[PDB]
C-alpha cells in the first residue's frame, strides 16, 4: 500500500501541472495566424537525383557546407554525396549491414553510423591516411541505435532502442552521461542549434526534454496517441515539432509547454517518418508512409505544397542550413532533391 | 568543366563501377531469418549446419548462405521487422517437450508469435519453415497438461501430428504462403537438406512468378 499511496499524490501532481497547462492556454496559435497572408502554392521540381544506391535508403543528413550529404542504405554501404554535380565522393563499407541512422559532423571531419547491431561506428573522412577508417567502435547499448547525432566534434549524442539515450565521448568511448526515463524504445532525437538542450521521442506517445551537461529531464511533452517515429527542432531553438504513426504532426513550445496545433488531414491516414523545418519557419516538410511527401504551413496548418516524386515510402528527409534545397530519400533506393 | 571537374567525373565513374561490382557480388547470397525462441535449439541448428544480432555464414554445395540470428533483441519487434522484408525464408525453432512449463504455457504463447508473424502485411508471400526440438523427451514424458482438448491417444506419432497440425493452420495467411514443416529429430544428419530443397522450391516458383507463367 506504500507504493499505492505514492500513486494518487503523483496523479494530483499530474493534475497540478495540467491545470497549470490549461491556465496558460486560452487562445491557440491558429486564431493568431488568421491575419497573416497564406503562403499559397509551393511548386518544387527535382533539380538533382542523387541515386546510385541498390537497396532501401533509410537515413540522410546534410553537411554544414550544404553541398555534401551522407546517405545510409540497408545494402551495407554508406555514401557521402555531392548536391550540384550529383557525383558520389566516398563509399563506405559497413561491418554490419543493418543501419537505421547516420550523422554528418558539423566540422565535416567525421561521420557517425549505427544500426540495430548495438554498435555505434564513427568514421574519419579527411584522414592523413587518405582512406576512410573507423576511428573506434562504440559499444555500450543493449537495444537498437535508432538515431545518432553529432553535438560536437568530440561529443556525440545517440538514441538507442534500450529505452535510454547516452552522451558519448570519442577519446574514451564511455558514457559520460546517460539519460533514462523513457519507458519504451526511443526512435529519434533532434538537438537545438545552441547544442545545450535536446529532445527525444519514443514509443510512449510522449517526448521528453534533456539537458546535456548534467543529464536530467527538463520537460515532459505528451499529447500523442501512438509512437513517435521522427522529431525535429525549430531552428529558432524555442520550439519543436513531432511526427508519429497517427498521421498527425504536432507543434510544441519548450517553456510554453503546450500543443499549439496538430497537422492532420482526413485523406492522410499514413503515419509520419520524417520531419524538417525551414530556416524562417513558415513551412513544415513532412514525409508520410504513403509514397508521396507533403509540405505543411507551420502557422496555419494548410495543404501548402505536395511532393509526389517517389514511388515508395519516404523514410528520410532533410533541409540545408542555407535553405537552398530539401533532400528526401525512400525505400525505392533513390535520392532526389527539390527546390 | 576543368581538370578538377574531369577528375571528379573520373572518380565518380570509378566508385560507381566498384559499387556495381560489389552489388553483383552481394546479390548471390541467400538471406535466411532465424526466429528461434528461448531454448529452441539455436545452438543445435548452428552446430548442425557447421551484443546485438549474431551473423553466421556457411556454404552448401555451390550456394552461399547468409543467416542473421536475432537473439536477445529485447525491443519492440515492429520497428525492425521490416528490415528483413527481402529475406527469402523465415526459420522457426520450437521445443516440444516443454508443454509442462508455465511462466501461460510456453507452447501457447509460441503460437501467438507465429500467428502474429504469419498475418503481418510485410510477409504476405514469404515461405515459412518451422523446425522442432526435444521430440524424444516429449515422446518419453507424455497430454492433459497442455492440450486436454485433444482427448485422444497418448502415442507420440499421433500427438506430434496433432501439434504440427495446429501450427500449420494458425491463420489463413498461410494459404497464399507455403509452410514447410519438418519433424526435426535433433540428431538427423543434414536438416539443411530440408532447407536447401525448400529454398530451391521457392526459387523455381519465384522465378516462375517472374517468368510470367505461374
Amino acid at each position, epitope marked *: 500500500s506504500e507504493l499505492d499511496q505514492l500513486r494518487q499524490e503523483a496523479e494530483q501532481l499530474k493534475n497540478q501541472i495540467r491545470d497549470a497547462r490549461k491556465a496558460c492556454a486560452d487562445a491557440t496559435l491558429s486564431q493568431i495566424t488568421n491575419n497573416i497572408d497564406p503562403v499559397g502554392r509551393i511548386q518544387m521540381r527535382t533539380r538533382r537525383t542523387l541515386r546510385g544506391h541498390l537497396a532501401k535508403i533509410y537515413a540522410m543528413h546534410w553537411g554544414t557546407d550544404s*553541398r*555534401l550529404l551522407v546517405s545510409a542504405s540497408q545494402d551495407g554501404k554508406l555514401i557521402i554525396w*555531392d548536391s550540384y*554535380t550529383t557525383n558520389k*565522393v*566516398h563509399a563506405i563499407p559497413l561491418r554490419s549491414s543493418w543501419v537505421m541512422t547516420c550523422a554528418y559532423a558539423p566540422s*565535416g571531419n567525421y561521420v557517425a553510423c549505427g544500426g540495430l547491431d548495438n554498435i555505434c561506428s564513427i568514421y574519419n573522412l*579527411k584522414t*592523413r*591516411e*587518405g*582512406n576512410v577508417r573507423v576511428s573506434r567502435e562504440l559499444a555500450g547499448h543493449t537495444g537498437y541505435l535508432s538515431c545518432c547525432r553529432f553535438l560536437d566534434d568530440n561529443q556525440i549524442v545517440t538514441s538507442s532502442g534500450d529505452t535510454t539515450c547516452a552522451l558519448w565521448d570519442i577519446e574514451t568511448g564511455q558514457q559520460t552521461t546517460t539519460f533514462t526515463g523513457h519507458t519504451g524504445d526511443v526512435m529519434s532525437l533532434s538537438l537545438a542549434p545552441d547544442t545545450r538542450l535536446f529532445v527525444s521521442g519514443a514509443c510512449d506517445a510522449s517526448a521528453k526534454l534533456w539537458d546535456v551537461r548534467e543529464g536530467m529531464c527538463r520537460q515532459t511533452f505528451t499529447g500523442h496517441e501512438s509512437d513517435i517515429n521522427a522529431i525535429c527542432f525549430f531552428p529558432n531553438g524555442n520550439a519543436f515539432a513531432t511526427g508519429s504513426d497517427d498521421a498527425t504532426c504536432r507543434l510544441f513550445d519548450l517553456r510554453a509547454d503546450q500543443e499549439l496545433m496538430t497537422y492532420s488531414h482526413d485523406n492522410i491516414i499514413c503515419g509520419i517518418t520524417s520531419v524538417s523545418f525551414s530556416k524562417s519557419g513558415r513551412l513544415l516538410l513532412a514525409g508520410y508512409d504513403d509514397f508521396n511527401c507533403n509540405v505543411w504551413d507551420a502557422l496555419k496548418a494548410d495543404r501548402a505544397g505536395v511532393l509526389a516524386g517517389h514511388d515508395n515510402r519516404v523514410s528520410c528527409l532533410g533541409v540545408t542550413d542555407d535553405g537552398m534545397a530539401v533532400a528526401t530519400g525512400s525505400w525505392d533506393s533513390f535520392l532526389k532533391i527539390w527546390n | *568543366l*576543368s*581538370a*578538377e*571537374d*574531369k*577528375a*571528379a567525373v*573520373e*572518380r565518380s*565513374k*570509378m566508385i560507381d*563501377r566498384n559499387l556495381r561490382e560489389d552489388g553483383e557480388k552481394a546479390a548471390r547470397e541467400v538471406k535466411l531469418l532465424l526466429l528461434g525462441a528461448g531454448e529452441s535449439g539455436k545452438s543445435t541448428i548452428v552446430k548442425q549446419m557447421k551484443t546485438g544480432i549474431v551473423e553466421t555464414h556457411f556454404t552448401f554445395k555451390d550456394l552461399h548462405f547468409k543467416m542473421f540470428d536475432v537473439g536477445a533483441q529485447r525491443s519492440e519487434r515492429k520497428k525492425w521487422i521490416h528490415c528483413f522484408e527481402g529475406v527469402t525464408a523465415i526459420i522457426f525453432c520450437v521445443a516440444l517437450s516443454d508443454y509442462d512449463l508455465v511462466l501461460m504455457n510456453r507452447m501457447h504463447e509460441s503460437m501467438k508469435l507465429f500467428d502474429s508473424i504469419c498475418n503481418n502485411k510485410w510477409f504476405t508471400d514469404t515461405s515459412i519453415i518451422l523446425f522442432l526440438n526435444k521430440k524424444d523427451l516429449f515422446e518419453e514424458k507424455i497430454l492433459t497438461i497442455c492440450y486436454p482438448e485433444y482427448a485422444g491417444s497418448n502415442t507420440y506419432e499421433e500427438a506430434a501430428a496433432y501439434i504440427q497440425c495446429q501450427f500449420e493452420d494458425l491463420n489463413k495467411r498461410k494459404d497464399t504462403k507455403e509452410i514447410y514443416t519438418h519433424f526435426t529429430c535433433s540428431t538427423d544428419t543434414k536438416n539443411v537438406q530440408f532447407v536447401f530443397d525448400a529454398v530451391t522450391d521457392v526459387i523455381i516458383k519465384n522465378n516462375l512468378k517472374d517468368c510470367g507463367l505461374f
Partner: single-chain antibody
Framework: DVQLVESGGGLVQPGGSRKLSCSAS????????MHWVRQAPEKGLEWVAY????????YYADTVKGRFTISRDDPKNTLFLQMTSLRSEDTAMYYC??????????????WGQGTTLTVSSDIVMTQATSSVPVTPGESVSISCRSS???????????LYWFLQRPGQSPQLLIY???NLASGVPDRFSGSGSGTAFTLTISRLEAEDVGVYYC?????????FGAGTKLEL
C-alpha cells in the same frame, strides 16, 4: 606514415631508354591519383605526366608525348614509368607526386624524394622577381601573374603554392588560392584577383627559406611558375 621512394635514377646514354619506378607504401594508392614532376638540375620545375585513379585517363606534355609512357599496378602497390629517347632536356630531378581529386581534396599534398637522372597553346605564368631578401620576423609578399584568369564558371579559382626546402622534397602550402593545407602553420595565406595572384607571408622565421612556386589547375597541363628563391 607514408613512403614515396624512387628507383633507378642514374646515367643513361643519350637517346636510349630507362625504366623508372616509384615505390609506394602506407596509403590507398589504388584510390590515389599519381603524377610526375620534372625538376631541372639547376633551375626550373615543370610537369611530366598524369595517370588516372583507374588508369583510364593519361596525359603528357609537349616534349613528353609519345616518347614517355606511365603505367601502374595496384596489387604490388607501386608506380611505374617507362622512359625513352633521353637527352639534355631529359636530364632532370624527377619527383614522385600523389594527388587525390574530389570536393575539398588537397591534390599534390605529398611528394617523393627524386631521381638523379643525367645523360651523357599553354598557359604562361611568371613570378615577378626570383630573389627577395628578407629578415626573420617581418612580413613579405610575393606573387605570380597568369596569362589568363583562373576563375572558372563554378566560382572557384584553381592555384597551388609550394615551398622548396633547400635540398629535399617540397610541400603544399595552400590549395585553390584560399585553403591552407594540413600540417602547415596559419601564417601562410594566399590571395589576389581573378588574374593577379599573390602570397602573404606573415612573421617568417628561419625555416621558410627556399624557392616558391605557383601552379595552374584549370587543365591537366598544370603549368608551373619560374620560381622565387626566398633568401635571408
Amino acid at each position: 606514415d607514408v613512403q614515396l621512394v624512387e628507383s633507378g635514377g642514374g646515367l643513361v646514354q643519350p637517346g636510349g631508354s630507362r625504366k623508372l619506378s616509384c615505390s609506394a607504401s602506407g596509403f590507398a594508392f589504388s584510390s590515389f591519383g599519381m603524377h610526375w614532376v620534372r625538376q631541372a638540375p639547376e633551375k626550373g620545375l615543370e610537369w611530366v605526366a598524369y595517370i588516372s585513379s583507374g588508369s583510364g585517363t593519361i596525359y603528357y606534355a609537349d616534349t613528353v608525348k609519345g616518347r614517355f609512357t606511365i603505367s601502374r599496378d595496384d596489387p604490388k602497390n607501386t608506380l611505374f614509368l617507362q622512359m625513352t629517347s633521353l637527352r639534355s632536356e631529359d636530364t632532370a630531378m624527377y619527383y614522385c607526386v600523389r594527388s587525390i581529386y574530389y570536393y575539398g581534396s588537397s591534390p599534390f599534398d605529398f611528394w617523393g624524394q627524386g631521381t638523379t637522372l643525367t645523360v651523357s597553346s599553354d598557359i604562361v605564368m611568371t613570378q615577378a622577381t626570383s630573389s627577395v631578401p628578407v629578415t626573420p620576423g617581418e612580413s613579405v609578399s610575393i606573387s605570380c601573374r597568369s596569362s589568363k584568369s583562373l576563375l572558372h564558371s563554378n566560382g572557384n579559382t584553381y592555384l597551388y603554392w609550394f615551398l622548396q626546402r633547400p635540398g629535399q622534397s617540397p610541400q603544399l602550402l595552400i590549395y585553390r588560392m584560399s585553403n591552407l593545407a594540413s600540417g602547415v602553420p596559419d601564417r601562410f595565406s594566399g590571395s589576389g584577383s581573378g588574374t593577379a595572384f599573390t602570397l602573404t607571408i606573415s612573421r617568417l622565421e628561419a625555416e621558410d627559406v627556399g624557392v616558391y612556386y605557383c601552379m595552374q589547375h584549370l587543365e591537366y597541363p598544370l603549368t608551373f611558375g619560374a620560381g622565387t628563391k626566398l633568401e635571408l
